[model samples]
Target chain A: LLPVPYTEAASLSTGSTVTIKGRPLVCFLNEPYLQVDFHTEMKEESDIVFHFQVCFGRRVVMNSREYGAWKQQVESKNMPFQDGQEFELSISVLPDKYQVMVNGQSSYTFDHRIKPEAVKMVQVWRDISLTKFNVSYL
Target chain B: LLPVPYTEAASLSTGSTVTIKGRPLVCFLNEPYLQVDFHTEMKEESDIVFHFQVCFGRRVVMNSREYGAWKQQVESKNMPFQDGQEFELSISVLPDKYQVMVNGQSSYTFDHRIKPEAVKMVQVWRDISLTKFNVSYL
Candidate 1:
């Protein structure tokens, strides 16, 4: 298995789709967290084009940071993930938004705050174990 | 270095002191977080006797959870931690409060919301790599 806190240089285009396969490190009652961020630069402190965070068994929060400040925030209570199970996640870059699918089921979406072209890095972190991560070439 | 998201089944009393040596996984600009919780049971979902959380370079939050609900929250902005440096932290359980020391200097204190005898486990987690962790026998 790959490390829990994993980072990879990435590229995203209109047709790009990021695929991640992982599992929470603890049970649902523990309130574990998972986070994925698309950044404009390779540095962790760079502007974020898209931010996705999930507090397992609780809620999901989405936002973006531009010019060193976070923008409008969005929250959802959708709980599509099965407790203590491996998960397959997909984030597809749409023309105007990013669509998130968990285990082949659409779970959430966030409208683009910055163009997909601005993304050069993707970081996935928090209390989870990773097995696979891939960004589409097309 | 010890892997993060660490947990230790611990016992605490009035004279006990928990010492930790660690470093933030990322720079302060990234707002890395560190959390320590003393639980009434070994399970992560168990009631918390003391909950301490820090957003590096930002703020610190202290609270307790009883009967599955969090109680009055306390927030502090005093950041004694230097950026990009390893830190030595100590939390001493006193008769009436928990005194926090950062690098040998008293940094914060929290009044006991529950008797220290109620704690059966301690968990240290989030965005930091630990090198040393010990609980005083006395």
Candidate 2:
């Protein structure tokens, strides 16, 4: 963890697995969630490849950021997280999509609205303490 | 570093860039090279679409091995690696070919010699100790 805003190195290439293993923190007055983002620029005003947000305001939001505007929130009713419980999440890459696996179970599959390799960096931020984070090629 | 007889998890997919980053070790009586191979069974006897070899036995060897029979070797005199040096090599996918880039330089373009997606596993083996290897979908 480098600070509040963590941006990964540019060495992340295709055939890479982004393994994020951690537990959600308990929140009452605060919004506790995790965002796995594939963004062109780390700034808030840049385009986002995939905005994977979990437990955001208690709803899972899926969308893309393009030209500084978020497309829309595609929310999922299935809540897969319990605060303070440890779990392993891996965003594995595929030809046509980016697959998300939670605690070793297939959770969601995100179709490439944006080209995958154009995604230069992945940032895991917001309400999660990423215990272990690594990007490695297969 | 793992063992010498190495086996890697499969990460071959479309829009994926397979990078082989390693420093070549000294070889007086032997040859050192890098290969990106797409296989069906992860077995030597299986059908291979792309047998991409660089600095192979003092030559560049292309051509596939369908089953146990070896195809005619496609050789190139352009050698890209030397002992005790590091390089970054990537095989980027296109609709019809796998573009090979060495040290960020375009070295060769290999036509999709096999049915593109027929390759489920990519294995890079031989004399170089692969420091970093991965494939991620774009």
How many clashes does each candidate structure show, in the order listed? Answer: 0, 10
lDDT of 2 by residue, A29-115 (tens): 123556777777644445778888776336777888787666867877655665457768888777788878878788787778877
Looking at model 1, the pairs that clash are none
Using alpha carbons, what is the TM-score of model 1?
0.93
Q: Across residues B31-83, which tens digit of lDDT does each residue of candidate 1 receive?
A: 77888899999888899899999889999999998999889999999999888
Per-model TM-score versus the true fold: 0.93, 0.45
- Report the C-alpha lDDT of model 1 over A1-138, residue by residue, as the tens digit: 987568899989888999999998877766778889999998889998999988899999999999989889999999898899999989999899999999999999999878999999999987788999999856
TM-score of A-chain in each prediction?
0.97, 0.84
Candidate closest to the true structure, highest DockQ:
1
Q: What lDDT tens digits, residue by residue, belong to model 2 across residues B1-138?
A: 433324454645558787878754333122344556777666544667778766533777777777655677777776666555777888888888888887888877777766667776766654455678777678
The true-versus-predicted C-alpha distance at residue A48 of model 1, in Å, is 0.9
Looking at model 1, what is the TM-score of chain A? Answer: 0.97
